[PDB]
Symmetry: D2
Subunit: 140 residues, 4 copies
């Protein structure tokens, strides 16, 4: 049961980094998470309009998780699939998968959840229209 | 329900680091995972006997996940709860929770899973006796 | 000539972390810099009064550098020497050295330079009295 | 005295990452160093032949330093200039500068030094011909 390129709507390429490999020769399992919210926020920055610097509205990570199938190593060229699952109105949930360039099978694959808040108060908010617009653009 | 200090068998203290705090003031959600397998492996190193540098046997992270309840920021003094859930014989599952010093409530809390393999072949193996001994030592 | 514990006025202990070790077994050369401004800012926070979250005044790193003498690896217990070299009035220069516990010889050793600015304008400022007080406290 | 695109021979583009920004909104000064040896080793991997996994021969960082001129922030598109200064025969010295895409002026700029060794012994060695070949290819 290993995810596939075509199950995902948006694709970020990310350059790997020397100190991505951990001591056993392969990208540390933690790094995948960094690849996630990079992948996400990049999309959010360029399309949702936020404005992190910036924004009166910001997303927060309340939970995440990831499953690892095959190893990847610097310097290889990883690239990140992205698609939205559930989606409340102060809240969302993404599905990420990392693919090696030219492979149908995901290398690992995971999910996490954003909760949008007012920056100052950290109190939940409706997803403003422009975010919601681009967010929805990734719904299955 | 937000986990509690006494539900956990082993305790690693970890110094937070300047660049732990992300752009919105608080320790990045990713860092938690770093705190996990630090917390784990540290115990593994000192009590399972491995031997990561030298070990013919090494652990791999095949999945992990985490839920976040309250924010923490450098320079505060986090400290990490640890306990084993399930436990096969080439395989294990930890349950981690991070605690601010002193608070009864976990700040976030998560789990992940080790698979022990022969370093060279990366083929699964029986948990050698010393590991299994200290691992089991954390069983509920 | 390899620096020595007694040449340094303040001492931060820092827990090493699993993914500190790079692919060749030893704490990545980059991590040292992380250890620096952790070591610094920690002292700054607790004794200069800033206040990074809240501070109208913040420090910026305009240059740094480091020389490496002996390797260190998670899980060993490094610990960080600190002292001030030069010291203008909107500007300062620290000298850091990392020590294995206990060794008289520094493992690596480096320096870097803070420039205090008004957070908003990022325009240079006089070091406010409390900072200057604790800063000077580390002058040779 | 701020470096210029045309003073450098090779150019790595590197994607920035969410947790590159530190607490004051801009890429942490430590990250530049990660950008350095990424930039380097990538070139070394694809052209010097090593083989880090791999190699009986590996490079080590004995010193580095960096000067910061202008700030950069995720998600902007940084990209790394690269050119060799000095060059012994067990030893080398690179000059790095980071450029924002479409700027003549470097954002920061730095140097560091490799020392090649036999992996196992960590004892110096002559730069094998293929490395030396591509290394030299970057001499002023």
């Amino acid at each position: 049961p290993r995810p596939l390129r075509e199950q995902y709507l948006h694709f970020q390429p990310i350059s790997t980094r020397w100190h991505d490999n951990d001591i056993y020769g392969h990208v540390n399992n933690v790094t995948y998470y960094a690849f996630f919210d990079t992948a996400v926020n990049t999309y959010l920055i360029e399309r949702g309009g936020l404005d992190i610097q910036g924004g009166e509205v910001i997303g927060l990570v309340v939970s995440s998780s990831c499953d690892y199938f095959a190893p990847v190593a610097f310097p290889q060229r990883i690239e990140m699939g992205l698609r939205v699952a559930r989606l409340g109105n102060s809240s969302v949930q993404y599905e990420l998968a990392l693919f090696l360039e030219g492979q149908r099978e995901a290398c690992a694959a995971g999910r996490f959840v954003h909760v949008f808040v007012e920056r100052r108060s950290s109190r939940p908010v409706a997803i403003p229209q422009e975010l919601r617009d681009a967010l929805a653009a990734l719904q299955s």
